[PDB]
Amino acid sequence: LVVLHKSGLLEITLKTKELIRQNQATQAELDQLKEQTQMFIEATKSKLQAS
């Protein structure tokens, strides 16, 4: 941990886990936005309100 801090791999590890976290959140948001699309454009060819 001392070497980790002085090498600054500590900072890198933490910022990297945080960026991974953020990226997973963006992936989740993107998946939901995806499902509502491909469902929006679908009700324009003939559930939605219920959603």
């Binding site: 600054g8 910022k15 960026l19 953020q22 963006t26 936005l33």
Partner: protein, 47 residues
């Protein structure tokens, strides 16, 4: 009260918020990518 130009305008309103969500996520991702660049930089400087 109004006529089904209610339809048209409902559709447009929904499409607009949905697209707004798209640009919000797009902004999010770019911020992530710059953080990426910073991490990759910082990581190039470790022996």
């Amino acid at each position: 009260d109004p006529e089904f130009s209610a339809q048209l305008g409902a559709m447009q309103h929904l499409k607009d918020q949905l697209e707004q969500r798209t640009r919000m996520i797009e902004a999010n991702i770019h911020r992530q990518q710059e953080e990426l660049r910073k991490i990759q930089e910082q990581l190039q400087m470790v022996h």
